[PDB]
Amino acid sequence: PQITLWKRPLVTIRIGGQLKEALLDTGADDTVIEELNLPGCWKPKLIGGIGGFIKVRQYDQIPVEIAGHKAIGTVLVGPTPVNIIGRNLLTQIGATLNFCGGGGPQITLWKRPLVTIRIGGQLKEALLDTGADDTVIEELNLPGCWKPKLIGGXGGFIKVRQYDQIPVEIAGHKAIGTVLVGPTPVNIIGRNLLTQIGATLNF
Numbered sequence: 001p002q003i004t005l006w007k008r009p010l011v012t013i014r015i016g017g018q019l020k021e022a023l024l025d026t027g028a029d030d031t032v033i034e035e036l037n038l039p040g041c042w043k044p045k046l047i048g049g050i051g052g053f054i055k056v057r058q059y060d061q062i063p064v065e066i067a068g069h070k071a072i073g074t075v076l077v078g079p080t081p082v083n084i085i086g087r088n089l090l091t092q093i094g095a096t097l098n099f100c101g102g103g104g105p106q107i108t109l110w111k112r113p114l115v116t117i118r119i120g121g122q123l124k125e126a127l128l129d130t131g132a133d134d135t136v137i138e139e140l141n142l143p144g145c146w147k148p149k150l151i152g153g154x155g156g157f158i159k160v161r162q163y164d165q166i167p168v169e170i171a172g173h174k175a176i177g178t179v180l181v182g183p184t185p186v187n188i189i190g191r192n193l194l195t196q197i198g199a200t201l202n203f
């Protein structure tokens with residue numbers, strides 16, 4: 001399908017025989033699913049997100065059908081806020097990010113989709129994250145008025161400053177919208193700005 005990002009890119013998946021809903025998440029290295037039982041030897045891992053780290057169980061070589069497309073790979077099971085399909089399985093179903101519906105750059109998901117942005121006069125690197133509702137940038141000056149906000153993911157919540165009507169140029173495409181500033185480990189471009197640059201998921 002071609003999926004736009006006005007709403008969360010939620011899809012049905014089938015894993016261990018169970019239908020579940022999950023978010024197609026380009027900002028996730030790995031696929032993380034809520035507590036469930038899977039049939040194998042697992043090993044403990046820790047994984048991280050904007051709000052810190054959580055402990056998960058790693059299962060390898062698990063078949064997962066993602067809107068009807070077959071994958072077989074690593075699934076992490078644990079107390080994630082939202083079930084997420086990450087790049088390890090997005091690559092298997094041929095999913096790419098495309099600007100302007102395919103007329104602009106195509107970004108494959110073999111590695112993290114990092115791009116250059118311009119914000120507040122400054123050039124920075126940021127992750128294109130279809131699993132993020134909002135855009136979160138590393139501690140920086142945005143002059144002007146803001147509202148406090150807490151945002152979560154995964155590990156928990158961090159406190160950020162919400163600024164409105166901030167111009168952000170993403171790979172040379174102009175966007176303007178809300179930017180959240182706080183101690184994120186990675187600058188994140190979320191759906192609020194990805195929709196303005198016509199970014200779609202395609203597989």
Ligand SMILES: CCCC[C@@H](CN[C@@H](CCCC)C(=O)N[C@@H](CCC(N)=O)C(=O)N[C@@H](CCCNC(N)=[NH2+])C(N)=O)NC(=O)[C@@H](NC(=O)[C@@H](NC(C)=O)[C@@H](C)O)[C@@H](C)CC
Nearest residue numbers: 027028029030047048049050081131132133134151152153
């Ligand atoms: C689980 C909640 C939904 C998915 C998640 C994906 N964000 C990426 C951002 C990149 C990190 C800052 C992520 O957590 N990725 C993880 C997913 C876990 C995984 N294992 O793949 C990741 O790749 N982690 C890697 C690497 C982390 C960074 N590493 C590094 N900088 N070296 C890892 N292996 O631990 N989205 C979010 O965290 C966003 N949350 C949301 O959009 C919503 N919040 C909730 C709780 O649903 C909304 C209501 O606010 C944040 C940014 C606020 C807008």
